[PDB]
Design a binder for this molecule. Structure first.
Ligand code: HEM
Ligand SMILES: CCCCc1nc(Cl)c(CO)n1Cc1ccc(-c2ccccc2-c2nn[nH]n2)cc1
Ligand SMILES: CCCCc1nc(Cl)c(CO)n1Cc1ccc(-c2ccccc2-c2nn[nH]n2)cc1
Ligand SMILES: CCCCc1nc(Cl)c(CO)n1Cc1ccc(-c2ccccc2-c2nn[nH]n2)cc1
Ligand SMILES: [K+]
Length: 463
C-alpha cells in the first residue's frame, strides 16, 4: 500500500487542506501528524512527500536510481519543457545530463576554464558596481546580469557587454518567463486542469519567449558550424556539435540541433535566476549582519590581499567566507521542495509500495533546517558551518542543490559564482544600507513554492 496521509476528498483529493501560501510549512505540519513519509492527492494523483534527512537520504541516495525520475505535470506539456535536461526522463535525460556534466567540468571545454569565465565576469561585475557611484541601488538587475553572462560565455563562448541590447533582450525574456512561472496560478491552479489549459495567453507568451531565445541560439549555432575547429572546441555548442559527429551512425540520436536548443534554454533557465537570487539574498544578509561582512573582509585581506582577483584556490584558506556562502544557501532555502521527482519503477520503500511513475516531493527545507544539525535553524548564523577552532564544518544536511542522481548540474558552477562574485564585491566595496540594520527584515517572502528575498536598496561604497 501507499504511505498514509490525510484522507482525500472525493475528486479534489487533499487540495483544499494544503495551505498554498507556504507549501513547505504545510508539509512540515503534516509530517507532525503522519510522519516522514506520507501521501497527498492532487485530484486522484497521489504524491508521496519525503520529509526529514533519513527519508530523503534513503530515497535519493540509497535508492537513487529508483527515485531519479522527474515528476511531470500538465505545465511541463504546456510550456514545452520535457526536451532538454531539467524536465527529461529516461535515456534522453541520462545522455544529455551525462554529456552536460562532462562538458561543464572546469576544463571541459578547451584551454579556457570555467573559472576563468567566472573571474572575468566578476571583474565586469565590480566595474558595473563602481558605475553606480555609490548611490542607492536596487541590485536586482546587476546581480542578474552576471550569472546570465556566465551562461552566455559557456554556451556561445562570448560574454556580452552589459548594455549590448541583444544581451538585454535575452535577460528580459528570461526574467519575464521566470516571473510568470512563479505565479501560483501557473505553478498550482493550472495543474488541476489535466487536459484543458485555462491560461492560454500566458502559455503563449511563455512559448513566444522561448522561441525568441531558441532562435537566437540557432543563429549562434550556424556561426559555430561554420568556424568549427574539431581539435579546439571552445564552448558548449562546439562540444555539442562534436558529440553530434560521433553520433552519426547512431540514428536516431538524442543529440540534435533540437535537443541542443532545448538544452541551452534549460541552462539559461536553471543557471541564472537561482544564483542571481542567492547573490541578492547574500548581500541583504550581509547588510543585516555587518560583523559577518567584516570577518569575510578580514579573510579576504589576509588570504587574498588587494592586488589580485579571488580564485577558487583561496577557498580552502577561507573557512569563514566558505561557511558564509554555505549558510546563505541553507538559510534562504530557495527551492524548499526542490523540483518534483517520480519513481522509475514499482518500489518498496520502508513498509510501503510506491507505484512506478508516482510523483515524489522532497522536502529540502526539512533537511536544510534540521533543528539538531543546525540549532536555531531559522536564524542566519555562519557558525552552523564552523567548528570550535573556526575551521569549516561540512554537513550531510547541506542539500540546497538536492541530492542523488538529479543533483544540480550546476552545483560546482554555482559554487564558483557565489564565492568569486561575493569575494570580489567585498574586496572592492563596503555595503551601506539606506535604513538601519536593525529595521530591515530578512525573512524570506514565500508564495506557494517560491521563496525570495524582500526588496531593498544599498550603496556600494568603494574601498
Ligand atoms: C545557487 C544556485 C543553484 C541552486 C540552488 C540550484 C539548485 C537546483 C536544484 C534544487 C535542482 C533540482 C534537482 C532535483 O531534481 O532534485 C536543480 C536542478 C538543476 N540545476 Fe540547478 N541550482 C543552481 C544553479 C544552477 C546553475 C548555475 C546551473 C547551470 C548549469 C544549474 C543547472 C541545473 C540543472 C540542469 C538542473 C536539472 C538537473 C536534472 O534534472 O538532472 N543550476 N538545481
Ligand atoms: C492570446 C494569445 C496572446 C499571447 C500573448 N503574447 C504576449 Cl507577448 C501577450 C501580452 O499579454 N499575450 C497575451 C496575454 C493575455 C493575457 C495574459 C494573462 C495575464 C494575467 C492573468 C491571466 C492571463 C490569461 N492568459 N490567458 N488567459 N488569461 C497573459 C498573456
Ligand atoms: C527564454 C526562456 C526563459 C527560461 C525558460 N522559460 C520556459 Cl517556458 C522554459 C521551460 O521550462 N525555460 C527553461 C527553464 C528550464 C528550467 C527551469 C528551472 C531550473 C531549475 C530550478 C527551477 C526552475 C524553474 N521551473 N520553473 N520555474 N523556474 C526554469 C526555466
Ligand atoms: C511541471 C511543474 C511541476 C511543479 C508542480 N506543480 C504542482 Cl500542482 C506541484 C505541487 O502540487 N508542483 C511541485 C513544484 C512546482 C513548482 C516548483 C518551482 C517552480 C519555479 C521555481 C522554484 C520552484 C520550487 N521547487 N521547490 N520549491 N519551489 C517546485 C515544485
Ligand atoms: K486570452
Amino acid at each position: 500500500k501507499l504511505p498514509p496521509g490525510p484522507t482525500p476528498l472525493p475528486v479534489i483529493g487533499n487540495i483544499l487542506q494544503i495551505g498554498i501560501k507556504d507549501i513547505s510549512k504545510s508539509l512540515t505540519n503534516l509530517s507532525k501528524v503522519y510522519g516522514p513519509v506520507f501521501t497527498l492527492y492532487f485530484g486522484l494523483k497521489p504524491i508521496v512527500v519525503l520529509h526529514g534527512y533519513e527519508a530523503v537520504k534513503e530515497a535519493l541516495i540509497d535508492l537513487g536510481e529508483e527515485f531519479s525520475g522527474r515528476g511531470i505535470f500538465p505545465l511541463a506539456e504546456r510550456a514545452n519543457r520535457g526536451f532538454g535536461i531539467v524536465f527529461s526522463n529516461g535515456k534522453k535525460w541520462k545522455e544529455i545530463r551525462r554529456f552536460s556534466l562532462m562538458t561543464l567540468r572546469n576544463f571541459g571545454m578547451g584551454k579556457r576554464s570555467i573559472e576563468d569565465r567566472v573571474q572575468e565576469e566578476a571583474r565586469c561585475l565590480v566595474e558595473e558596481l563602481r558605475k553606480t557611484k555609490a548611490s542607492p541601488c536596487d541590485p536586482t538587475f546587476i546581480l542578474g546580469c552576471a550569472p546570465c553572462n556566465v551562461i552566455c560565455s559557456i554556451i556561445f563562448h562570448k560574454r556580452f557587454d552589459y548594455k549590448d541590447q541583444q544581451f538585454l533582450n535575452l535577460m528580459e525574456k528570461l526574467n519575464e518567463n521566470i516571473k510568470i512561472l512563479s505565479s501560483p496560478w501557473i505553478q498550482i491552479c493550472n495543474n488541476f486542469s489535466p487536459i484543458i489549459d485555462y491560461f492560454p495567453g500566458t502559455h503563449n507568451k511563455l512559448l513566444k519567449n522561448v522561441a525568441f531565445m531558441k532562435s537566437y541560439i540557432l543563429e549562434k549555432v550556424k556561426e559555430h558550424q561554420e568556424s568549427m575547429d574539431m581539435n579546439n572546441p571552445q564552448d558548449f555548442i562546439d562540444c555539442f556539435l562534436m558529440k553530434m559527429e560521433k553520433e552519426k551512425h547512431n540514428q536516431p540520436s538524442e543529440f540534435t540541433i533540437e535537443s541542443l536548443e532545448n538544452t541551452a534554454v534549460d541552462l539559461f533557465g536553471a543557471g541564472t535566476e537561482t544564483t542571481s537570487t542567492t547573490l541578492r539574498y547574500a548581500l541583504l544578509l550581509l547588510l543585516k549582519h555587518p560583523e559577518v561582512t567584516a570577518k569575510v573582509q578580514e579573510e579576504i585581506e589576509r588570504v587574498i590581499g588587494r592586488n589580485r582577483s579571488p580564485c577558487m584556490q583561496d577557498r580552502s584558506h577561507m573557512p569563514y567566507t566558505d561557511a558564509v556562502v554555505h549558510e546563505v544557501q541553507r538559510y534562504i532555502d530557495l527551492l524548499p521542495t526542490s523540483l518534483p521527482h517520480a519513481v522509475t519503477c514499482d518500489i518498496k520503500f520502508r513498509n510501503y509500495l510506491i507505484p512506478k511513475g508516482t510523483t515524489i516531493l522532497i522536502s529540502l527545507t526539512s533537511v536544510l533546517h534540521d533543528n539538531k544539525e543546525f540549532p536555531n535553524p531559522e536564524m542566519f548564523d555562519p557558525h552552523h558551518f564552523l567548528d570550535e577552532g573556526g575551521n569549516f564544518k561540512k554537513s550531510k544536511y547541506f542539500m540546497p542543490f538536492s541530492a542523488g542522481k538529479r543533483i544540480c548540474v550546476g552545483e560546482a558552477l554555482a559554487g564558483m559564482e557565489l564565492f568569486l562574485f561575493l569575494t570580489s564585491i567585498l574586496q572592492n566595496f563596503n555595503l551601506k544600507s539606506l535604513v538601519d540594520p536593525k529595521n530591515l527584515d530578512t525573512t524570506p517572502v514565500v508564495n506557494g513554492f517560491t521563496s525570495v528575498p524582500p526588496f531593498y536598496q544599498l550603496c556600494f561604497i568603494p574601498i
